[PDB]
Amino acid sequence: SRHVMYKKTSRDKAVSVYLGKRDYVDHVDSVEPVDGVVLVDPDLLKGKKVYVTLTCAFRYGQEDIDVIGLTFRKDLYYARTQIYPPVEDPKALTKVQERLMKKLGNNAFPFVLEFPDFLPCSVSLQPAPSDVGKACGVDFEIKAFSTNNLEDRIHKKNSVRLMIRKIQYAPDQPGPKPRAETSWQFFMSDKPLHLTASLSKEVFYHGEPITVSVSVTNKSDKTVKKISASVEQVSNVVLYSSDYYIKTVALEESNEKVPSKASYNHTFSLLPLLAYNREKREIALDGKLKHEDTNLASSTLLKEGTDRTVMGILVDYKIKVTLTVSGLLGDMTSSEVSTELPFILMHPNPD
Template structure:
């Protein structure tokens, strides 16, 4: 018999599992998983937890997995899921000669509440792992969405070689996120000059942004400068923001999705100049039906946003990241009897870095960027 329920423990998300194991038919156990929060910062946070047990061995794992394909394909042997990173620790019985642990305020409170059979532990996540990304499924898609996700799982077993059934384990999905760096580069700028037949002088287009990094939900300000010394007329200006998704694991698929676009019926006459700033705001709410759009990792019953730009650090293996996301702003001029004239500029779309007190849900004071969990088992 298995009962699985997801509940709330104050501000802390948690999940409880009650079941009978075949190897212990007369025993029933309960395993609860508590998290201090769902979102963890790239290269800043670590993972802490607490648990108890009376029989066999209790393990907890942290897994980063990449999925690219449909669940039904796994049945015929075409596995499109790969574990990029797996970290396992034995929670009970305690490993001999283990160094004493320094408890965080949240762990101390949970251990007092859960009783004397609670055992704390900590995960240190490896550097250069990918951030959580979900590819938006189509209306008819079923099963798990493609992308990169992180999972924390607790289970009881005689050893790690046993096959762990979903009914006998408790799991919660977490997100690994990246915040915008404090140091930013110069504002992007691009220009081009186009010479037309039957015209002695060229058309010059210059486009620029007011900064390199924009936060989700902020308008992107695009300044367009046109110096039209030709005898042709610019009939329309098109500005768009494109998301480029590179799938670098399993395949070399590349998708470009327009997430925001605007067409301005501005006319620039021959032998004249033009300058104006436009604002565009790329939002997920305007792109709900676009299959394959990259989103920040989605948690159950929670909304998300467009995926943040992937920031590559020196020495990072692109293939391990699974999916790379970038954005660009395109400015195109529609010229009478002359085709289009356009430029492109890279733009970074990310979340701002919040204060420490905002990051660590369930903790009453700053604690240096720690991830917190709690396991509880009782017979």
């Protein structure tokens, strides 16, 4: 039984919001709803009506939504539900809504705000210290407030705001094994540099090592000086500025030589975590850096022909294995050749 719960009271002692979670799982097929409870104080309400909202929104300039001096903002969703005076809709309470209701008492009014399937998940771009202002990403916010009319300035102490998150999971099995053969033919004649990278599965979760079986067969006269397997994260902003970023989030090298007429076989273990990329800036995270529950951003996925500008940021990951061949181009020069496999990265299934 989960004993933990998130709550915040409006600083006029009028409204108060109570959530079980802050992180809601997008299962691709469906999304977890925001089942919550709102407390009221009819005396201090002063005959004002109370509503609850759910706002998904892209921002650009600052970290959070509720901050002065944004460069751009574009709400991607809005909902509203009157909780007091209550439009009498006695729906079945969730097991979480029971826990929150009993403790409070009679002035506890449940609610359920739903999530669309066209929205992205939570994503944030931590900017470089110098380029502070490039900061952008998608945010989510539950908010409750007391009001009379529907077109009024909501006062400082009337409102109450909880920053929530949307995180993405999907099953990795049953799934195939991605493979990539490739054969470079430099020079006269037909003597190829064969490379063969492969994966065990297409989906991966934060914390999971990513095994890449490499298989080189060097028929050329020239030698392979280094072999290296990496995880690259590409980020594409698709609102306001539309910037582009790329980061190596994991890397493992092999300084072993692979000369002519030789063959190489090794399985690299790559582990892209934020832990080893804290110092790195201009990187796509699924939250704020200071928070502990933050990881690298999940793989964005676009269905059919959805408006790309909706997603806010497009994050994708790929494996990349790179051979560093001595000679090849130039009499005495080291050149590089690579081959890239894409994969999905997501948040693991919560307990």
